[PDB]
Design an enzyme around this catalytic site. Structure first.
Site, PDB file in Angstrom:
ATOM      1  N   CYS A  35       0.332  -0.755  -5.455  1.00 30.93           N
ATOM      2  CA  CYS A  35       0.638   0.100  -4.317  1.00 30.93           C
ATOM      3  C   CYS A  35      -0.087   1.429  -4.491  1.00 30.93           C
ATOM      4  CB  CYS A  35       2.149   0.291  -4.226  1.00 30.93           C
ATOM      5  SG  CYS A  35       2.716   1.586  -3.122  1.00 30.93           S
ATOM      6  N   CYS A  38       1.993   4.644  -3.903  1.00 33.70           N
ATOM      7  CA  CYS A  38       2.915   4.786  -5.031  1.00 33.70           C
ATOM      8  C   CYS A  38       2.246   5.496  -6.197  1.00 33.70           C
ATOM      9  CB  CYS A  38       3.395   3.411  -5.484  1.00 33.70           C
ATOM     10  SG  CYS A  38       4.259   2.491  -4.194  1.00 33.70           S
TER      11      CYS A  38
END
Length: 111
Positions: A35, A38
């Site tokens: 991600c 993230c």
């Protein structure tokens, strides 16, 4: 920082119980290695863990490393942040906004 890395359901349960006993809020970053946003927001989560050290407990859950916890928490999109109080979920925030993560932590550090 001082983010605590969750590696199992048992570790998760123990941390939630600690926040209950200490009467300190817990903020959790649900993250994944794949991600992008993230990984972009992880440094800020670390900085916040320092800024609020001793006041707010910070946990990290890699959703693929601890799938049982991700499933029980109902994760579907990332980043997801949860706040736990008294062993149960009290608030959440889904998305990569740094301003909003800062505001979430500030709200519960003051509540």
């Amino acid at each position: 920082g001082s983010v605590i890395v969750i590696d199992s359901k048992a570790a998760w349960d123990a941390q939630l119980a600690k926040g209950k006993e200490e009467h300190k809020p817990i903020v959790v970053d649900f993250t994944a290695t794949w991600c992008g946003p993230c990984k972009m927001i992880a440094p800020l989560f670390e900085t916040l863990s320092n800024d609020y050290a001793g006041k707010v407990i910070f946990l990290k859950v890699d959703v693929d490393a601890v799938a049982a916890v991700a499933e029980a928490a109902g994760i579907t999109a990332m980043p997801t942040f949860h706040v736990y109080k008294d062993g149960v979920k009290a608030d959440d925030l889904v998305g990569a906004s740094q301003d909003k993560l800062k505001a979430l932590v500030a709200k519960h550090a003051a509540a």
